[PDB]
Enzyme design. Structure first.
Site: not given
Length: 439
Positions: A198-199, A201, A203, A217, A309, A314, A327
């Site tokens: 659970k991030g 930006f 999930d 995602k 990023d 990632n 990502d």
């Protein structure tokens, strides 16, 4: 025109075969065209395991890229920056339940729902706070599509329930776009097993799609779903063995938006490094990971994409140790960014470039040879950029090969143009491997 050899098609239905030459297959299977036969309705093709046979063109959908144009959308009834009067015009002939969503002129940052009730058109303000949408501040939503599902099912306070959308012009239904391009998946065949992370930006959840483990995602704070569209689109255009592969898209009319991805059993590279650590991961393993990421990056640069990023978190690792960049939310052609991984010019300038990506690669390598340790260990997050710009550079990790550290350093030059190309990075990492300068 027939499908050229090598074209990929996803099966729309199950095919059981009509003759002995036919190649059976299941719905959702990926088929690679070999050659069209004397009859245009049938082609010779191969399945993932390589088996060849005849199949019907009618049964497969050519898989192709989707460009997230400025016209691509999941909300026909969404009109962007349309004015109040304009909605009044767009909604002139009094029709009960005729609605349309627009941004908020009146209240900046929010949106507005416009309905035609009784000879009148009510305008309800939709508040956007903490990444949620709400009109009555009792029921909240993740995106405008869910809000519309809701108020279409019942007026729930509004002067009337929503019935007919005022379809803006030029709108391109992304649902049939991804569908026609062979990227649409069916929710009924997806069983969400557990939440992997659970991030901030988005999930990520482990799932089961047609019998196979898969990654699903969802993107947070994406009211118009454009972050979702942008990420899915770019993914339909990426194809490299070191980039996490898109399996498809799932769009529930209720508003649930998902990106289905290949499952990467070993989790993020950060964790993999921390768990197994120094006593398990040899120099070859570390360099092999660096080359994996580097090739992915050379591929992105070669296709004019900037990741923006790149970091060990990632980068995921498959069941048989292949590191792949993932990502792609922030991925766009040569133009918020994680400060500890972003190049100085990038945080300051409004444009990003492959050279900032190279800088991030430098940071990532440091993460690799540090076994997951966090960048700039003994410095306050408020000193980084100023120290860095004052020439600071992290120290080579413990037991780090001098040559590897020089690659890092080469990524950290303050004058971006002086930074190496990803191809030059690959060549040097290969020069290191070739002379075993890492062992």
């Amino acid at each position: 025109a027939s499908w050229p050899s090598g074209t990929e098609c996803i099966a729309k239905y199950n095919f059981h075969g009509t003759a002995e030459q036919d190649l059976p297959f299941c719905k959702g299977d990926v088929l690679t065209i070999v050659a069209v036969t004397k009859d245009p309705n049938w082609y010779k093709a191969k399945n993932k395991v390589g088996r060849e046979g005849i199949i019907p063109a009618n049964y497969v959908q050519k898989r192709e890229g989707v460009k997230a144009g400025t016209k691509l959308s999941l909300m026909p009834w969404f009109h962007g920056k349309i004015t109040r009067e304009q909605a009044e015009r767009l909604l002139y002939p009094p029709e009960t339940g005729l609605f349309l969503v627009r941004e908020s002129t009146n209240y900046p940052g929010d949106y507005t729902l416009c309905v035609s009730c009784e000879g009148k058109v009510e305008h309800y303000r939709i508040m956007y706070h903490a990444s949620k949408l709400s009109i009555d501040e009792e029921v909240y939503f993740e995106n405008l599509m869910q809000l519309v599902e809701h108020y279409t099912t019942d007026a729930d306070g509004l002067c009337t329930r929503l019935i007919k959308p005022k379809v803006m012009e030029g709108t391109v239904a992304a649902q049939d776009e991804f569908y026609r391009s062979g990227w649409a998946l069916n929710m009924k065949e997806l069983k969400l097993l557990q939440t992997i992370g659970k991030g901030e930006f988005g999930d990520v959840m482990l799932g089961d799609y047609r019998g196979n483990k898969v990654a699903v995602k969802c993107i947070k704070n994406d009211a118009t779903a454009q972050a979702f569209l942008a990420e899915a689109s770019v993914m339909t255009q990426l194809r490299h063995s070191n980039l996490v592969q898109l399996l498809g898209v799932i769009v529930e009319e209720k508003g649930g938006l998902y990106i289905v991805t290949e499952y990467m059993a070993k989790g993020s590279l950060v964790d993999y490094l921390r768990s197994r650590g120094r006593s398990v991961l040899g120099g070859d393993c570390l360099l092999k990971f660096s080359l994996d990421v580097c090739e992915a990056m050379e591929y992105l640069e070669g296709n004019n994409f900037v990741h923006r990023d790149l970091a060990a978190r990632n980068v995921l690792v498959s069941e048989d140790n292949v590191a792949k960049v993932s990502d792609f939310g922030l991925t766009k052609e040569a133009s918020k960014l994680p400060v500890k991984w972003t190049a100085p010019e990038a945080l300051r300038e409004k444009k990003f470039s492959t050279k900032s990506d190279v800088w991030s690669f430098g940071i990532l390598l440091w993460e690799i040879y540090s076994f997951g340790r966090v960048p700039y260990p003994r410095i306050p997050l408020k000193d980084v950029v100023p120290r860095v710009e004052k020439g600071y550079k992290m120290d080579a990790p413990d037991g780090c090969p001098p040559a590897v550290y020089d690659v890092m350093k080469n990524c950290w030059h303050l004058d971006a143009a002086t930074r190496p190309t990803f191809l030059q990075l690959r060549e040097q990492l290969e020069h290191i491997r070739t002379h075993e300068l890492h062992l």
